[PDB]
Design a protein around this ligand. Structure first.
Ligand SMILES: OC[C@H]1O[C@H](O[C@@H]2[C@@H](O[C@@H]3[C@@H](O[C@H]4[C@@H](O)[C@H](O)[C@@H](CO)O[C@@H]4O)O[C@H](CO)[C@@H](O)[C@@H]3O)O[C@H](CO)[C@@H](O)[C@@H]2O)[C@@H](O)[C@@H](O)[C@@H]1O
Ligand SMILES: OC[C@H]1O[C@H](O[C@@H]2[C@@H](O[C@@H]3[C@@H](O[C@H]4[C@@H](O)[C@H](O)[C@@H](CO)O[C@@H]4O)O[C@H](CO)[C@@H](O)[C@@H]3O)O[C@H](CO)[C@@H](O)[C@@H]2O)[C@@H](O)[C@@H](O)[C@@H]1O
Ligand SMILES: OC[C@H]1O[C@H](O[C@@H]2[C@@H](O[C@@H]3[C@@H](O[C@H]4[C@@H](O)[C@H](O)[C@@H](CO)O[C@@H]4O)O[C@H](CO)[C@@H](O)[C@@H]3O)O[C@H](CO)[C@@H](O)[C@@H]2O)[C@@H](O)[C@@H](O)[C@@H]1O
Ligand SMILES: OC[C@H]1O[C@H](O[C@@H]2[C@@H](O[C@@H]3[C@@H](O[C@H]4[C@@H](O)[C@H](O)[C@@H](CO)O[C@@H]4O)O[C@H](CO)[C@@H](O)[C@@H]3O)O[C@H](CO)[C@@H](O)[C@@H]2O)[C@@H](O)[C@@H](O)[C@@H]1O
Ligand SMILES: OC[C@H]1O[C@H](O[C@@H]2[C@@H](O[C@@H]3[C@@H](O[C@H]4[C@@H](O)[C@H](O)[C@@H](CO)O[C@@H]4O)O[C@H](CO)[C@@H](O)[C@@H]3O)O[C@H](CO)[C@@H](O)[C@@H]2O)[C@@H](O)[C@@H](O)[C@@H]1O
Ligand SMILES: OC[C@H]1O[C@H](O[C@@H]2[C@@H](O[C@H]3[C@@H](O)[C@H](O)[C@@H](CO)O[C@@H]3O)O[C@H](CO)[C@@H](O)[C@@H]2O)[C@@H](O)[C@@H](O)[C@@H]1O
Ligand SMILES: OC[C@H]1O[C@H](O[C@@H]2[C@@H](O[C@H]3[C@@H](O)[C@H](O)[C@@H](CO)O[C@@H]3O)O[C@H](CO)[C@@H](O)[C@@H]2O)[C@@H](O)[C@@H](O)[C@@H]1O
Lengths: 140, 141, 140, 140, 140, 140, 141
């Protein structure tokens, strides 16, 4: 494609999602998580030139974080926390941008991926009550 | 919209809506009032370049205030708003860092956070009553 | 004007002062404060090409600090501590210059202003036994 | 050659492996380890333009970490923790990249190697239930 | 003049001194102080191309510090500690140079001046048993 | 020579060694040490274009560290810990390279040398059960 | 004098005078010995470039030593000597920092200090017996 697909980490459960838009990049991303379950539960994404909110999961966590991304702003550091195996889950995400902005959502107590970097174009994975699995998508 | 970038308004749906914005103008001063009692922002005042008027919203009942004065060439390079999410949400805190290494920290960051768009601060929008129900920043494009 | 007026922070009390000189900038500023009251009590300013000391307040504090400012030296960082409201006071001042000089006077327990920056031209406010309120004045 | 072979550290046990691809570099590396044994147990590698997973060891650890490596991204810092001698094992790996990405797997309580640096081309060693020994391979 | 006169800080007591030499700058300065009185007691200065030691005060303190200054070396940071008022004294001096050298003499428990900076040309003040008052002198 | 010989630090005991190779530099160095004796016991060196391991001492320590050195990589900081006198020993070595790699072996509770720096060409000293004395050798 | 800068000799008037200097030579190595018992320097050794001789003064009775090796192009950019002042004075400590980021710290800094001239270290001068009574550094002009 014109795209780099980072590994989807977590389990095989939930309903698949792919959030990507032709000629579009992510302008906003929101992560919801709980202290009760130490999991991500819900993600929302907006793309440039598109008022629609693309949402997956169940927003039942007691915390959320939003990162807004300027048009020229890239991801220079990216860590996803997860529980591995078929019954796995995403537990946490840390993003750092080319403008020194960062967010930290959830927990990093089991497994980690340090992903590919670049301009964040989309996300892919599976979600039900929780985020079962998450992979980032970048421009080439 | 072709001149402005609207950061997400974070917090609840309550209070009276406000938009503090002036044509050809940017914010020269912003004041945040907050309480240790409620751990909320209660009151915001803004001045714009070439305008002696003070634009105020909320109830200045907090025991703390912070003022940031912004030089004409000074931009926001880092911006975090703390809030309680949901319909009955509130803004709890704001942290701003400028291109000249100035910063302010008001209030509390214990629940939800937004790391916003950056640039030249043109205005603010949201809702306020006794508290700041919700706050969104506005930047020049 | 030729001048930028920073917000006067503190209360409405004391006797007004405005210390400014045409074609002049502050060459020296002195702050007097007490541990007993945790307030500024007295300020003195000198201007270039002027031997006069312009003083306001009551110099009853147990501490003073002086900053001398070279002709080409600007203020790049300025924080004033104060108690807000009609019965407010200035409690503290921190200044940092373009030559890496700094001073710290008094206390920062309640409210703070981070002011405009530039060439320090004057001060304005009110003073009696204490510094009720203080605003810095810069060259435009 | 076109390759720099870092010292294989650990013991003489397990089944030998050499994972390298001519005109290929590692795009992804995964380390599995346990708190129970404080050892690495399993490694997987993928090469650019190749969906096949090269795996060695037994993935029985309770933790894994993945590092994804951009095509232009090199290793600038590399530490392997191991137990020395014939009955040795690899206990840990830390990698830092030219883009400021890092991973840390396992434990560093006995012996350490700080390896050669450069573009990670492959791995070599021996593995059974555990990673007995590991050496990194770089482009010249 | 060719000179910048920093404020003399401390009291009105002791015998006046001015140490300056035409076309000359300070090559060496020594400060003597006591733990008993927490005051400066004695200062000695040497100038380039001049073997004479210029001394004032009474060298009765239990500590001394010497700063030697290279011909091209300027003062980039200067703080004098003092007790304010007519019966004041100098308690301390801190100097930092353009070559990253620094000295710290005495105590800074009451009042402070952050002085003008530049090439140290001389000193002026009053001294008896102690240093009553001190001002630095720089080239323009 | 073409060589700078750092001071051999430690005692006069053990069997002398000199590890150098014409037109060669050290590509790998290993230090073995014990918590029991808080001494270095054994050193191994490899040179570029030479598969031979040059070893001295007795590898009886419970720890080892290896530093691999890229062909263009120099030592920018070097500290050797030792026990002084005729019955002295080397207790520790810390090396930092031009690529930001470092190793720390053993203990620094007694004496220290901060050595010459540059391209590490060889080592010289004496060794028996312990490393009695160690000196580094650099290119001019 | 047309080739050398003499830093002040600090400490007392006691011990046997020494001057360690070699024409067209600079210090390639310097060793300081000191004690926790007396909190003094006791012994100094110096080597010069192109000279296998060790120049030593004092009594090496301290429980600590440090050595600084100096590359031919390496200068001193920071230098502090700790001492006890007066006729019966002593050197208690030395701290050196080089143009290549090397440093040593020997002994104690509890009484008096000199921050010296900087440059290429050519030699040392002073007095020594059981202790280092006094020490002055010598630099190339
Ligand atoms: O901006 C927020 C709302 O402001 C207006 O509504 C006001 C709001 O004020 C209450 C009030 O709560 C009191 C206690 O009942 C409460 O338990 C305690 C919190 O521990 O705080 C007070 O003692 O004030 C708090 C703190 O400022 C407010 O956060 C809280 O919402 O609601 C009151 C109840 O309806 C109302 O009387 C006030 O006028 C209003 O503009 C609304 O639309 C805003 O959302
Ligand atoms: O600039 C500040 C004001 O100065 C003038 O008023 C002065 C003000 O001084 C008081 C005084 O407080 C002390 C006692 O007076 C007080 O009763 C006590 C207990 O409440 O606390 C202190 O001991 O001094 C302090 C320290 O200077 C001041 O902070 C405090 O405001 O009030 C005095 C008596 O009412 C008055 O005599 C003083 O002259 C005046 O210019 C006023 O306008 C200014 O705001
Ligand atoms: O990679 C290492 C070796 O793997 C293969 O052999 C395996 C090896 O496994 C043992 C085993 O030890 C467990 C118990 O068997 C042991 O008695 C107990 C004592 O404290 O500790 C463990 O519970 O598993 C551990 C954990 O992985 C290993 O560290 C340990 O080596 O040995 C087994 C029998 O001796 C063998 O059956 C296993 O397959 C083999 O390929 C060998 O060459 C490798 O070195
Ligand atoms: O003859 C000595 C100097 O006289 C003039 O200086 C005066 C001199 O007075 C000192 C002073 O000493 C006391 C304290 O002030 C001092 O701080 C303390 C510790 O040093 O020790 C004494 O207690 O004052 C007493 C007065 O009681 C005098 O007897 C004594 O000579 O020193 C003062 C501090 O520098 C100074 O202020 C005085 O003017 C001066 O003219 C000088 O030439 C003489 O050497
Ligand atoms: O052979 C005599 C030495 O003479 C010259 O040096 C004298 C010498 O005096 C010391 C000194 O020792 C005590 C303390 O002063 C010392 O600091 C401490 C730790 O070293 O140990 C002793 O307590 O004085 C004693 C007697 O009071 C002498 O016996 C002893 O030798 O060393 C002094 C310090 O350097 C020096 O100032 C003296 O001039 C010198 O020629 C030396 O080589 C001789 O050994
Ligand atoms: O994404 C998680 C899962 O959601 C759906 O299964 C749900 C699951 O909920 C469990 C538990 O797995 C979850 O962590 C906690 C907190 O969110 O809730 C429940 O404890 O399983 C329960 C019961 O089996 C279901 O009620 C619930 O739907 C489903 O879409 C699945 O595919 C997905 O993996
Ligand atoms: O390199 C040290 C020493 O080695 C040889 O002497 C050995 C030495 O062992 C002692 C003690 O020196 C050492 O710290 C520990 C740990 O290695 O072991 C022993 O307690 O001294 C013993 C005497 O008992 C020797 O037999 C032993 O071989 C020798 O090559 C010597 O020259 C060298 O300094």
């Amino acid at each position: 494609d014109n795209y780099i697909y980072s590994t989807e980490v977590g389990g095989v459960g939930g309903t698949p999602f792919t959030f990507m838009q032709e000629s579009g990049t992510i302008t906003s991303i929101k992560f919801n998580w709980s202290d009760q379950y130490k999991l991500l539960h819900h993600i929302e994404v907006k793309f440039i030139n598109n008022a629609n909110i693309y949402a997956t999961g169940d927003p039942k966590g007691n915390h959320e974080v939003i990162l807004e991304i300027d048009d020229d702003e890239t991801i220079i550091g990216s860590v996803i926390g997860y529980k591995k195996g078929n019954d796995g889950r995403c537990t946490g995400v840390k993003l750092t941008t080319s403008k020194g902005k960062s967010i930290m959502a959830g927990y990093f107590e089991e497994s980690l991926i340090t992903t590919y970097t670049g301009k964040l174009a989309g996300i892919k994975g599976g979600a039900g009550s929780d985020i079962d699995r998450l992979g980032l998508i970048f421009l080439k």
